[PDB]
C-alpha cells in the first residue's frame, strides 16, 4: 500500500514524495488517511484558487506539529493523486500559520525522470513567478475559512530543505 | 486498502463513503473488487448517459441483494475513482428492478468538507431537478442490456435512509 | 492491493489486465511498484506522442527480460492508471530492442464488459490504422531518450499471443 | 463567417457540416444564430445524457420544420464547436415529435480527412451499437421538458439521406 | 459576427452577455477585439486563481471606464468562449481600483435556458459562498501585478444592476 | 472577422499569431478557411503524436509555398482555436518535404501578455528539449502519409525570423 513507500533511495538527496493534490486540479483537498492508506476528501477549498504544483509528502517522516513533511513538485503535467514520484529538494518555504512555524519544501523530479530541472539546485533556480505564485496561494486560500490564516517569512535554501527532511525522518523513528 | 475503511465515524448520522465512478464521467462503470481492494472495470455502458452524482458504497454493509448500501453523493465537483468522502445521509430512492426491490440512497458531504449542504437535511431538500435526473437515469441507464430493467417506486426521507444503514451495517457482521 | 489480482480467470482465454497508462493521455510514463502495489512515475516522456490505447501488465507473469507480460487494450473510452480490466488476447506485436525481443500483446475487453469488441478474434481483424499506430509508436517514442531505440519485427496471431502467456505464467511460480 | 460556409463541395455526395455540439460534451445545447453566425446557448440540456456523436446542420439548406437539415457526424476526437467538417451522408434517422415529422441524416468524415469511414458506405455499415446508441438517445434526451416527446420510425439508406439534401438545397434557393 | 449581437431581446430584464472567459478554466484572460470580433489573448493571469462564474459583457453598451459593461453569469457546466447566453440581471458588485470606480454585473441564466435560477430574483439570492467567492477572486486576482489593486465596495440589488444596463446602453448610441 | 486580425502592431518585432492548433490537443488538424474566416477540419492525423507548441500563421502575410506564414507558439497553458495571440519572433526551423523548402517560425508571448518570456530572446535560448520536441515531431507526424516526408534542415536565428516575416507581408501586399 502506499503506507509502505521508503523516505527516499538516499535521503536527504533522493526523496519519493506521495502525491495528493494534482498541479492545477479541481478544488478538492485530498489526504492520504494514514490509517487505510486510501485517499480521502479533507475538503472542497472555498477560495477560487487551486494548487501552482503538485502536493504530497514524503511518508516516514513527522513535523513538529505532527504531520509528515509536505512537498510541492513542480511538474510538466499534473500526476494522478495517489502517485509516487522521485525528487531532490531544492528550497523551503517558511511561513508562521496560527499555530507558529509551517515549512513547505520545494523538490523537483528527479533526472532520471526528466532533464527538464536538472539546471535548478538550488532556491534560486526556481523561475520568480513560481515561487511568487506559491507564496502568494499559501497567503490567501484559507481566506475564506475562519479561524485559519498564514503569512510568510520567506525562503530558504537546498541545505534547510534537507536539514528538515533529515529532522523529521530521524524524529519518525523513536517519536 | 479500501477494504478497511470504516463504516462511518458515527453510524449512521455520519458515514464515509468509497466512491467507484465520478459525476459526468465517461460511461465506464468501476466497481471496487472485495478481495483485492482494486479498481475494476465492470463494463462499458451502452446508452450515452452519465451519473449525475458521484457513486459508491459504504463499506462493511450488506444489503438484501448481497452488496455493501449503494449511495449517490452530490459535490461541487467531480471526485477520484477510490476517493473516500464524508457525508450525511438525506434520502433514499427506492427502485424495483427484475429482482425486485432496489434503494440507492442519497448522502451530502458532511459540514466538515464543505458548508453548501448544510441546509439540505432531508429528501425534499435535494433541488427537484436533480431528483428527476437521478430518477430518469436509473429507469434507463440498463435499456440496451438485454434482460435488465428498472422502475422507481419514489423518494423516501432520511429516517428511512438511516435505517436502510443501520439494518445493512448489522447485517454484515453476523451473516 | 494490486499485487494480489489473478492472472486471469481462465487463462489464456480470459486475463486480467491492470492498467498503468491511459489512452491519449498526458506523456507520463506510471509503473506499478512491484513492492508496494502503488503508481510510480517511471518518466515523463520526451516525445510529443501518447500511448494510442491503454498499457499494462498481466500479474503474476515473468517475461524474459524479467517483467511481467504487458498489453496492450483497445476501449471505447481511457482506463484510470491502477484499474483492472477482463480481456481477451488477440495478437502480439514482436519487435527488437536495445536489449533483443520484445513481444507486446494486444488484448481487446472481454464480451462481458462490452460486445464492441466481440468480432476481433484475432490480429487480422484490428483495423489497419490502428496497428500501424500501434507500430510506430514502439518505433519512435524512445528517439529522444539516449541509448534507447526499438524495431518492429511484425505481428503475430492470437495463438502465438497466448502461448506468451502460459509461457511466463508457468515462468513465474517456479523462477 | 460561419453564415458564408458553402452547402458543399459537390452535393450531395460530398457536403459540410457545421458542427454545433461536440461528441461526449457537457449538457450544453449550442446553435449557430442565422443572424449573426455566433453560439448560441439554446438551453441546459435537463437529463443526464450526451450526444454520441458530433451534432450539426449543412448551410444553405432548409428542411420542411423551418430549420437547416441536421446532421450526425462521428468521429475519432470530439471536434469543437463552429468547426466545419467535411462529410459523406450514409443515412437517416426518421422520427416523430411535438411538432411533427424530423428527420436527422448520418454523415461520415470525408476520406480526405480520414480513410477510418471509407467502408461505411450505407446505412447498414455503422455500428449496430452506435446505431441503438443514437435512437435511444433521441428518444429520451428531452424526457423531462414539459410537453416534449420522441418517437423513432426507423432508419433509412444513403439515398434517401442524399434526396433529402437535395430537396432541401433546392428548398433555400427557392425560397 | 459577435460585433453584431443584440444587447437583449428586451433590456434591461433579458439580456444577452457574451462570453469571454469560462468558470473554471486555465488562467488564461480572453477578451473579445472591438475591431475584429476575434478572441484575443490580453494576458496570461500570475496568480493561481480562476473565474468563479463565466465572465463577459453585454454588446451595445458603454460604461463610464469606457467598455462595455461586464458581466458575471453561473451556469451549471462552463461555456465556450465567444458563445452568447441569455441571461438576467441580478445584481452588481461594486469596487474601486488603480483607475477608479469599476462595477462587475452579475446575472443569471435566462429561464428559458434553465429552470434552475428561477429562484433567484436578486443578489440576497445568490448563495453566500458564491457571493464570497466572486469578491474574494476580484480583491486578489491581480496581486501579483506591479501597480494594480481591487477594494470591494459591496453588493448592490438587481435594480441597480438594470439602471447601469440602461445608463450604459443609452450611452452606447448616444456617443 | 479572423479575417481582419492586423499582421502586427509592429511588424516585424511585434506580431500576431492566429491560433489554428493548441498544444497537447487531440489528433485533429484545423486551419482557417481563408473565404470564410471559419475553422475547418483539414483531417484527423494518423499518429499518436500531438502538437509540442500552439500552432498557427500570421494574417496578411503570403510564403512562397502559397500559404500564410506559419508560426509555433509555446505558452504556459493551450489556448483556444481560433484566438489571437500577440507575440515576438525568436526563431526558424528549416525543413524540406515532398513540395520543397518548408520554414516555421518561432514566436514567444509578447512581453504585455506574460513576463515568463522575457529571457527568450533568440533561438538559442529556448529550452533544449523544447527544440528537440519541435523538430522530431515535424519529422515524424506524417509518416503514416502516403508520398509525405519531412527532413529537418536546422535553426535559423531571430533576424532570420524576422526577415522572412517582412518578406512574406511584403509578398502580400503585392500579389
Known amino acids: 500500500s502506499l503506507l509502505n513507500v521508503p523516505a527516499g533511495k538516499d535521503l536527504p538527496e533522493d526523496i519519493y514524495v506521495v502525491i495528493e493534490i ?5 478544488p478538492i483537498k485530498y489526504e492520504i488517511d494514514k490509517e487505510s492508506g486510501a485517499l480521502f476528501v479533507n475538503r472542497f477549498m472555498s477560495t477560487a484558487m487551486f494548487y501552482p504544483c503538485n502536493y504530497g509528502y514524503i511518508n516516514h ?3 513538529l506539529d505532527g504531520d509528515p513533511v509536505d512537498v510541492l513538485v513542480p511538474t510538466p503535467y499534473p ?19 496560527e499555530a507558529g512555524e509551517d515549512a513547505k519544501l520545494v523538490a523537483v523530479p528527479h ?10 539546485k538550488d532556491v534560486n533556480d526556481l523561475p520568480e513567478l513560481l515561487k511568487a505564485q506559491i507564496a502568494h496561494f499559501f497567503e490567501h486560500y484559507k ?5 485559519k490564516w498564514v503569512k510568510v517569512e520567506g525562503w530558504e535554501n537546498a541545505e534547510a530543505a534537507k536539514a528538515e527532511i533529515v529532522a523529521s525522518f530521524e524524529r519518525a523513528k523513536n517519536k
Open 22 to 26: 494534482p498541479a492545477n486540479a479541481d
Open 61 to 63: 517522516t513527522l513535523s
Open 79 to 97: 500526476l494522478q493523486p495517489g502517485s509516487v514520484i522521485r525528487c531532490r529538494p531544492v528550497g523551503v518555504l517558511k511561513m508562521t500559520d
Open 111 to 120: 533526472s532520471k525522470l526528466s532533464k527538464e530541472y536538472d539546471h535548478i
Open 143 to 147: 481566506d475564506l475559512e475562519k479561524g
